[PDB]
Amino acid sequence: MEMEKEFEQIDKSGSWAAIYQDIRHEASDFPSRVAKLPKNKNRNRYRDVSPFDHSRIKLHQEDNDYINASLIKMEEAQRSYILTQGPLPNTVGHFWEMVWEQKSRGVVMLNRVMEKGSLKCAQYWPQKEEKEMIFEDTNLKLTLISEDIKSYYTVRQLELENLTTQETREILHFHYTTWPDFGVPESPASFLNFLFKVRESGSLSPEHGPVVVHCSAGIGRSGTFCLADTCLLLMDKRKDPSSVDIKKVLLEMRKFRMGLIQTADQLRFSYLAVIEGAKFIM
Numbered sequence: 340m341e342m343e344k345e346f347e348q349i350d351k352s353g354s355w356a357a358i359y360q361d362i363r364h365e366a367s368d369f370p371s372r373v374a375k376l377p378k379n380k381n382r383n384r385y386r387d388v389s390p391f392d393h394s395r396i397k398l399h400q401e402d403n404d405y406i407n408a409s410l411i412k413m414e415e416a417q418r419s420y421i422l423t424q425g426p427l428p429n430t431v432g433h434f435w436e437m438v439w440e441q442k443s444r445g446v447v448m449l450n451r452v453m454e455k456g457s458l459k460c461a462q463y464w465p466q467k468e469e470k471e472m473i474f475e476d477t478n479l480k481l482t483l484i485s486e487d488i489k490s491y492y493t494v495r496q497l498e499l500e501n502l503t504t505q506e507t508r509e510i511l512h513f514h515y516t517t518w519p520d521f522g523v524p525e526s527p528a529s530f531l532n533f534l535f536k537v538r539e540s541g542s543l544s545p546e547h548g549p550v551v552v553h554c555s556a557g558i559g560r561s562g563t564f565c566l567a568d569t570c571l572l573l574m575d576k577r578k579d580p581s582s583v584d585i586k587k588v589l590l591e592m593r594k595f596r597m598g599l600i601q602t603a604d605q606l607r608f609s610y611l612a613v614i615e616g617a618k619f620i621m
């Protein structure tokens with residue numbers, strides 16, 4: 340079926356939970372043996388969210404190459420994304436090592452450091468120009484260059500320096516600051532505006548390594564971001580945009596990381612975002 344009318348048909352019939360449970364039943368199951376090794380317990384935020392072995396990002400290190408991060412490679416859309424958990428106190432250096440080694444331009448953050456009164460990820464970037472951060476375990480230096488605070492999101496320019504080689508690179512930090520503590524946003528308008536700002540920066544384009552996207556577990560809000568981006572790109576590329584099947588795209592993405600889209604409300608919000616976004620593109 341088309342999307343907008345499949346949408347109204349699920350609303351009128353109130354069957355979002357049944358649709359979402361079908362997706363969960365059909366989703367791929369691949370091994371994640373490296374994630375579960377005892378030496379990696381303090382590298383995982385949640386025991387039930389792990390990268391598959393076949394698609395995990397490897398750190399360029401001979402001691403321990405493990406990080407909770409997955410490469411989502413979308414062949415028809417010609418887009419790639421790295422989806423990862425929010426960094427932990429003992430993985431902030433690994434996080435920036437990955438950004439460096441994978442040649443990423445942009446980092447997309449969809450959570451606040453504190454939500455619901457608890458810490459959802461480490462304070463992994465500097466908050467003042469004159470107070471830079473040094474990660475001694477991976478030999479990197481990170482400096483805040485500029486910060487632009489808007490009503491729904493903040494954009495930061497950061498300098499990452501590899502202290503071994505003295506090479507430097509400019510990294511863009513795109514921080515969506517207004518996702519509610521509970522539920523999903525009422526309108527997709529500010530989320531779509533944010534996605535378009537990331538696109539306009541070059542961070543999603545083939546001349547750079549894959550964008551790094553995270554929330555707390557790296558599967559819920561993060562899944563909504565890449566699912567909406569890929570579906571809108573396919574609607575631009577194909578002769579028949581109504582052929583784009585968001586459930587099929589989501590199942591394809593779940594071949595590369597488990598659990599993408601965590602609730603039926605997130606599924607409905609993803610439909611809403613693609614539907615509204617397709618009208619603005621034209």
Ligand SMILES: CN1CC[C@@H](c2ccc(F)cc2)[C@H](CO)C1
Pocket residue numbers: 368369370371
């Ligand atoms: C966590 N999950 C359990 C089932 C496993 C599996 C094994 C054999 C198969 F034919 C199909 C699935 C999967 C890969 O090992 C990991």
